[PDB]
Amino acid sequence: VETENIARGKQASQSSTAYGGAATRAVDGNVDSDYGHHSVTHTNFEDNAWWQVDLGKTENVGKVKLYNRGDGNVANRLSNFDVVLLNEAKQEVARQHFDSLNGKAELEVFFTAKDARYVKVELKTKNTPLSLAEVEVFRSAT
């Protein structure tokens, strides 16, 4: 995969916003996982919380890297979730489910040369907020 993080500075959005946890914080080029350092997103405590980045055009995606929240003992909120790739028409082109990060600070997700415009993280869990320190997206190596 390429080394350029193509998610950086792109339009990001999420199911709702709480505690000032703006969606753009996951694409601000700062993986700092401490919520108090203002680089981690936060939705409402809600069902099926989600976060999305629009890559702005269709890209051949090979890797999505998630950086979890690290302060406050709430890392396990990022559990039982999908990482989803959508095309320009917003149809799913790939989807991977994950149980846990197992206390790891980050998760590398590898996709098999998928042409996608949107990258989405979807919690499948009830009444839980989605918080991401960063989401980085990399093109497949040519």
Q: Give the x/- contact pattern for Ca ion in 66-105, rule: CB under 5 A.
A: ----------------------------------------
- State CA 40 to chain mean position distance: 11
24 binding Ca ion? (CB under 5 A): no
**Which listed residue (7, 15, 23, 28) binds Ca ion by CB under 5 A?**
28
43 binding Ca ion? (CB under 5 A): no
User: What DSSP string describes 56-106?
Assistant: EEEEEEEEEEEEE--STT-GGGS-SEEEEEE-TT--EEEEEEES--TT-SE
We find the least distance from the C-beta atom of residue 108 to Ca ion, in angstroms, to be: 17
Nearest to 64 by CA among 81, 47, 89: 81
Q: Which residues bind Ca ion (CB under 5 A)?
A: 25, 28, 30, 39, 134
